[PDB]
Amino acid sequence: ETLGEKWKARLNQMSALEFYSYKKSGITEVCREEARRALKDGVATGGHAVSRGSAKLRWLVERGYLQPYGKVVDLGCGRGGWSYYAATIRKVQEVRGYTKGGPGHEEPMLVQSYGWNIVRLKSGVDVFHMAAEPCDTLLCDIGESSSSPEVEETRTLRVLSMVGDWLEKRPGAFCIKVLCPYTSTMMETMERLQRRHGGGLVRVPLSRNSTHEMYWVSGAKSNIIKSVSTTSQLLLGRMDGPRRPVKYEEDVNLGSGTRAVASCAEAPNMKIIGRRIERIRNEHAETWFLDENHPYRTWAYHGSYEAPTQGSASSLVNGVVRLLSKPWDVVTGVTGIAMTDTTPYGQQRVFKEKVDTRVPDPQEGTRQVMNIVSSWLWKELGKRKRPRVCTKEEFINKVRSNAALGAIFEEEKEWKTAVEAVNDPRFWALVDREREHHLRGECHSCVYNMMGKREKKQGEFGKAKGSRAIWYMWLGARFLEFEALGFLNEDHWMGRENSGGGVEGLGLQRLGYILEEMNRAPGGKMYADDTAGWDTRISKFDLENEALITNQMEEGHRTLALAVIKYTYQNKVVKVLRPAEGGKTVMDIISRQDQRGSGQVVTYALNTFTNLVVQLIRNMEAEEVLEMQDLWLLRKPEKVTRWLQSNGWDRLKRMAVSGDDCVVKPIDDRFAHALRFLNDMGKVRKDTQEWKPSTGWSNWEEVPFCSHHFNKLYLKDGRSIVVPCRHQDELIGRARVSPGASIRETACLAKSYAQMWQLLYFHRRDLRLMANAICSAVPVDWVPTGRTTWSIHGKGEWMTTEDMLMVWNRVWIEENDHMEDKTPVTKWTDIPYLGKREDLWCGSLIGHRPRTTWAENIKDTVNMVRRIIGDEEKYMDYLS
Ligand SMILES: Nc1ncnc2c1ncn2[C@@H]1O[C@H](CSCC[C@H](N)C(=O)O)[C@@H](O)[C@H]1O
Ligand SMILES: [Zn+2]
Ligand SMILES: [Zn+2]
């Protein structure tokens, strides 16, 4: 037995009074009182560290034991105080932390300390099953104390086995937690590892006397046994004599704000945007300034001005759906879904990692192939359709109740609602004036608005997730878009009849028929690889190839669409909100040149187009029509125009494309590894290694498309329908949330979900029962409200006070083109369910005792909810 085992053995023989008195005896501490008071109260600014760990690392760094720089990795991230500290050192550029989290472990915390923009914390990571990655600074703080020294030993040997792979990559600075450095085996192991990787062992005064932990740092050259046994001398010494007091030091203040970053700001053609930048600047001249610490990598920066906050992070629960869905109060999948954080911080922290990218320009051969396929496709789409300008009256008849103004300049902010503006002559005077500027070769007000999109998604770090970015221009500039390129949407250019592979206009009830069609054609498996962040992978050359419609128009229409495209789509000026220092928020004016905004009038069209192009090109690489040399320079383009002229349409009919989503049935499975052109075009797949072959489905029913799969069910009378399905937890979870706004206002928002379930997901036993329960518990004469899906394929047939079997017969029998027999179904009892196995697989709960009890007492619970909503309204019994 060594000195360490002496310390641990004497420690184990202690009692409550002994251990409590000994724990903090003579150690050093930081006043973490105001830190936890503010962290519990809320404030994300003010510079408060998220844990005591931040105090350890700093004490090391300021002593020279560690010199952080470059990319930091924080294994065993925890709350992440080590990451948030590292984000402050000047020579640090990027920080990425990983931790287990979940049940029992602390989850990463979200704070706005100086440099939070260079920190990416990921929870749910088990770093013992992680693959090592190169890094310039490696940090580890993993060691769970044990009463037994054997357990502490084997645990620390597990840790030191893990970290080795990371240390082979030769990191410049490192700081590992050694829980048990005192046993003989551990001293030998640390001796050989000290020989191989160097560094030393340091005892931090801030560690409590109840643990022998030491930190393996780079900037130490001490002897292993000398350091370990000297620390054992210190702790054993402290076990004897009177208890000595603690030395208190003020905790570290990490400031607040964001770091400046190395920029790849592509020169922004100041001739195009200078006038708009000047207009914004002069409009807010009193508080215009250049933030020296803006966090924009792949965007240009022009200035900021002080502006109030907007957006919300709150998520309210719909008590009616909750009360009527008890068995899912324990299911993690549905109880974790909530609204996203659309505040400046909540959007920004998704922006910095998902929107502030720059995709490298593809090789020239790929540029040529893209131009050929785009020209051919455009030509094919205009075979029996003609471009045309859309009109003020079409636009007026298209502006609905929920259409946002978007006023940016003083002129544009004169109306409350959109319909109030369109019926005003001064609005169209703004339109005319700006279009005159367009016809003079200028642009003075087509400026984008960016913010976060309130969505119902699963949370991250046990809190509400961040918000996906959405941007759109004000009403007048949107009108100019509609004028120019609106014909794409109005005349259904991308419809299945014209685009061949498109599915524009169709609803959620029809796509499954399309997929069943696609399966009948001979070929390989079906591939529905989604692209990761489409709107950020639309390159300058994709915009080029999409502008090739202007060579299909008359001269005036061409010049109009080439004022929109060039002055807006090819040069984007965006206004965003960002949290500044001291808790205030600010407006940033930025500008880039190579992405597709979410709210461009023709976004679904152009996206579906470019996606068709991409899938065609991939079909070419798969059928060996292209070769690995073709990326650099294309040899014999005629090898392409012949492939397109020969089999192009016969390939488009093998696709179902809806924007970024798509399904492709190729001629064989070579499509699985046709990755060179796909990757070179920036359309990197989702949820895979870049060069791993693609995986597909031999069962057309299991294929994902537009967030659903589709199943063919047979009615009682022999007929058949093809219905959309998804995992039930997303449906109930999405149903249990409310976007901020009486009980009536909620109960209606519940009836909408219940009727949508009665219309689309009637084949999910639980959702049908719960639909009858909600509708039985909600007053009959109450009109539904709210939104139940963001899908462009969710048409809203359920948002009515009309009987539901009527609309079911209408959309599944009467107006069903794939249903030839029109004999309507007379009772809900004749409409089938999914198979019990297929129902279970997608998240059914049938056969489980809890939900059988729920279904038995469902009527009594309905009467309960009738008590809660109101007892003098009229109700109906749909459960029968
Ligand atoms: N197997 C594992 N894989 C990843 N993380 C783990 C893990 N086992 C434990 N952890 C987590 O690693 C964390 C280390 S605590 C260190 C936290 C950080 N240094 C700070 O300043 O707050 C613990 O919270 C623990 O929950
Ligand atoms: Zn303009
Ligand atoms: Zn299913």
CB contact set of 84 (below 8 Å; sequence gap of 6+):
49, 50, 54, 111, 113, 115, 116, 119, 254
Q: What is the 3-state secondary structure (H, E, C) of 290-323?
A: CCCCCCCCCCEEEEEEECCCCCCCCCEECHHHHH
CA distance 71 to 96: 8
CA distance 532 to 686: 5
The neighbouring-strand residues paired with 215 are 177, 202
**Residue of the CA atom closest to atom 11 of ligand 1:** 76
Question: What's the half-sphere exposure (Cβ side, CA atoms, 13 Å) at 151?
Answer: 7
Which are the residues after which the chain is interrupted (C to N > 2.5 Å)? 741
The neighbouring-strand residues paired with 175 are 139, 217
The rounded Å distance from CA 294 to ligand 1 centre is: 31
> Please, what is the Cα angle at 860 between 855 and 863, to 5 degrees?
125
Closest by Cα among 323, 355, 318, 352 to 338: 318
What is the SS3 assignment for 740? coil
740 sits in the region (left: phi over 0; alpha: psi -120 to 50; else beta) called: left
CA distance 725 to 732: 13
Check pocket membership of 215 for ligand 1, CB cut-off 6 A: no
Check pocket membership of 247 for ligand 1, CB cut-off 6 A: no
Cβ atoms < 10 Å from Cβ of 277: 18
The rounded Å distance from CA 123 to ligand 1 centre is: 10
Angle between helices 765-777 and 744-760 (to 10 degrees): 150
The rounded Å distance from CA 341 to ligand 1 centre is: 26
Residue 468 φ then ψ, to 5°: -65, 140
Query: Is the alpha carbon torsion for 351, 353, 357, 359 positive or negative?
Result: negative
Task: Tell me which amino acid residue 403 is.
Answer: A
Task: Tell me which amino acid residue 771 is.
Answer: A
Task: Tell me which amino acid residue 248 is.
Answer: Y
Q: What is the 3-state secondary structure (H, E, C) of 601-654?
A: CCHHHHHHHHHHHHHHHHHHHHCCCCCCCCCCCCCCCHHHHHHHHHHHHHHHCC
Cβ atoms < 10 Å from Cβ of 44: 17
Q: Which ligand is nearest to the CA of 124?
A: 1
| Contact assessment for residue 281 and residue 563, using Cβ atoms and an 8 Å cutoff | no
CA distance 222 to 208: 22
CA distance 702 to 699: 6
| Contact assessment for residue 706 and residue 511, using Cβ atoms and an 8 Å cutoff | yes
CB contact set of 188 (below 8 Å; sequence gap of 6+):
none
Give kind and range of the element (H or E) at residue 16: helix 16-23
For the chain, state the CA radius of gyration.
31
CB contact set of 148 (below 8 Å; sequence gap of 6+):
none
CA distance 734 to 456: 6
The neighbouring-strand residues paired with 697 are 526
Residue 173 φ then ψ, to 5°: -130, 145
| Contact assessment for residue 682 and residue 537, using Cβ atoms and an 8 Å cutoff | yes
Cβ atoms < 10 Å from Cβ of 744: 14
Cβ atoms < 10 Å from Cβ of 169: 12
Question: Maximum Cα–Cα distance for the chain, whole Å?
Answer: 97
CA distance 699 to 48: 54
What is the SS3 assignment for 470? strand
Q: Which ligand 1 atom is nearest residue 104's CA?
A: 26
What is the SS3 assignment for 98? strand
Q: Which ligand is nearest to the CA of 206?
A: 1
Which class in CATH covers the domain with range 1-263? alpha beta
Task: Tell me which amino acid residue 722 is.
Answer: V
Check pocket membership of 804 for ligand 1, CB cut-off 6 A: no
Six token digits for residue 567: 């002055």
What is the SS3 assignment for 1? coil
Strands 137-140, 70-75: pairing kind: parallel
- The residue assigned the tokens 């950020």 is 536
Six token digits for residue 123: 């929870």
> Is 126 among the annotated ligand-binding positions?
yes
What is the SS3 assignment for 233? helix
CA dihedral 380, 381, 382, 388 (to 10 degrees): -160
Task: Tell me which amino acid residue 118 is.
Answer: I
What are the DSSP calls for 107-147, one per residue? Answer: PP-----TTGGGEEEE-S--GGGPPP---SEEEE------S
Check pocket membership of 126 for ligand 1, CB cut-off 6 A: yes
CA distance 805 to 717: 17
CA distance 530 to 611: 11
**Domains of the chain, residue spans:** 1-263, 264-880
Closest by Cα among 473, 487, 470 to 605: 487
Six token digits for residue 875: 């109700």
Q: Which ligand is nearest to the CA of 448?
A: 2
| Contact assessment for residue 202 and residue 217, using Cβ atoms and an 8 Å cutoff | yes
Cβ atoms < 10 Å from Cβ of 241: 9
Q: Which ligand is nearest to the CA of 56?
A: 1
What is the 8-class DSSP label of residue 572? Answer: E
Six token digits for residue 563: 């004022």
**Residue of the CA atom closest to atom 24 of ligand 1:** 78
| Contact assessment for residue 626 and residue 368, using Cβ atoms and an 8 Å cutoff | no
What b/e string do you get for 784-799 counting C-beta neighbours within 10 Å, with b at 16 or more?
bbbebbeeebbbebbb
586 vs 111, 254, 277, 308, 455, CA distance in Å? 18, 21, 16, 7, 24
How was this entry determined?
Answer: X-ray
CA distance 539 to 852: 54
Closest by Cα among 660, 682, 665 to 606: 660
| Contact assessment for residue 592 and residue 266, using Cβ atoms and an 8 Å cutoff | yes
CA distance 666 to 657: 14
The neighbouring-strand residues paired with 708 are 705
Query: Which of 95, 105, 139, 145 should be mutated for ligand 1, with most atoms under 8 A from CB?
Result: 105
> Is 99 among the annotated ligand-binding positions?
yes
What is the 8-class DSSP label of residue 334? Answer: H
| Contact assessment for residue 259 and residue 115, using Cβ atoms and an 8 Å cutoff | yes
Beta strands in 179-235 (DSSP E): 200-202, 214-217
Strands 288-289, 300-306: pairing kind: antiparallel
Cβ contacts of 62-65, under 8 Å, gap ≥ 24: 64/219, 65/175, 65/200, 65/202, 65/215, 65/217, 65/218, 65/219, 65/220
The neighbouring-strand residues paired with 589 are 303, 575
Q: Reported resolution in A? A: 3.3
Check pocket membership of 127 for ligand 1, CB cut-off 6 A: yes
What length is written for the chain? 880
Angle between helices 728-735 and 744-760 (to 10 degrees): 160
> Is 184 among the annotated ligand-binding positions?
no
Task: Tell me which amino acid residue 237 is.
Answer: G
CA distance 316 to 741: 8
Task: Tell me which amino acid residue 328 is.
Answer: W
CA distance 592 to 405: 23
The neighbouring-strand residues paired with 139 are 74, 175
CA distance 112 to 501: 46
CA distance 856 to 520: 44
Query: Which of 106, 142, 213, 251 should be mutated for ligand 1, with most atoms under 8 A from CB?
Result: 142
Closest by Cα among 607, 604, 605, 634 to 621: 634
| Contact assessment for residue 617 and residue 330, using Cβ atoms and an 8 Å cutoff | no
CA distance 444 to 431: 11
CA distance 345 to 258: 11
| Contact assessment for residue 749 and residue 786, using Cβ atoms and an 8 Å cutoff | yes
Beta strands in 294-400 (DSSP E): 300-306, 316-317, 337-339
Angle between helices 224-238 and 184-197 (to 10 degrees): 140
Give kind and range of the element (H or E) at residue 175: strand 173-178
What b/e string do you get for 120-134 counting C-beta neighbours within 10 Å, with b at 16 or more?
bbebebebeeeebee
CB contact set of 365 (below 8 Å; sequence gap of 6+):
629, 630, 631, 632, 633, 634
| Contact assessment for residue 30 and residue 51, using Cβ atoms and an 8 Å cutoff | no
> Is 443 among the annotated ligand-binding positions?
yes
492 vs 408, 435, 485, CA distance in Å? 31, 26, 12
- The residue assigned the tokens 């014999």 is 636
Beta strands in 788-828 (DSSP E): none
CA distance 818 to 327: 37
What are the DSSP calls for 506-570, one per residue? Answer: --TTTHHHHHHHHHHS-SS-BB-PPBTTGGGS--HHHHHHHGGGGGGS-HHHHHHHHHHIIIIIS
Question: What's the half-sphere exposure (Cβ side, CA atoms, 13 Å) at 468?
Answer: 16
What is the 8-class DSSP label of residue 13? Answer: T
Q: What is the 3-state secondary structure (H, E, C) of 743-777?
A: CHHHHHHHHHHHHHHHHHCCCCHHHHHHHHHHHHH
CA distance 508 to 879: 26
Six token digits for residue 35: 């830190």
Residue 380 φ then ψ, to 5°: -70, -35
> Is 366 among the annotated ligand-binding positions?
no
**Residue of the CA atom closest to atom 12 of ligand 1:** 76
Closest by Cα among 292, 343, 265, 227 to 584: 343
Closest by Cα among 489, 501, 754, 753 to 600: 489
Six token digits for residue 709: 């799969």
| Contact assessment for residue 506 and residue 457, using Cβ atoms and an 8 Å cutoff | no
CA distance 81 to 56: 10
Burial of 492 (0-12, 13-18, 19+ CB in 10 A): middle
Question: What's the half-sphere exposure (Cβ side, CA atoms, 13 Å) at 727?
Answer: 9
> Is 127 among the annotated ligand-binding positions?
yes
Q: How far apart are the first and last CA of the chain?
A: 77
**Residue of the CA atom closest to atom 21 of ligand 1:** 53
- The residue assigned the tokens 């209606």 is 748
CA distance 419 to 427: 11
Six token digits for residue 727: 């995992």
Cβ atoms < 10 Å from Cβ of 292: 7
The rounded Å distance from CA 98 to ligand 1 centre is: 8
CA distance 315 to 304: 30
Give kind and range of the element (H or E) at residue 579: strand 572-579
Six token digits for residue 707: 């967030």
CB contact set of 478 (below 8 Å; sequence gap of 6+):
406, 472, 601
Query: Is the alpha carbon torsion for 420, 387, 600, 556 positive or negative?
Result: negative
| Contact assessment for residue 82 and residue 215, using Cβ atoms and an 8 Å cutoff | no
What is the 8-class DSSP label of residue 835? Answer: -
CA distance 785 to 798: 10
Closest by Cα among 489, 496, 488 to 513: 496
Check pocket membership of 99 for ligand 1, CB cut-off 6 A: yes
What is the SS3 assignment for 371? helix
What is the SS3 assignment for 717? coil
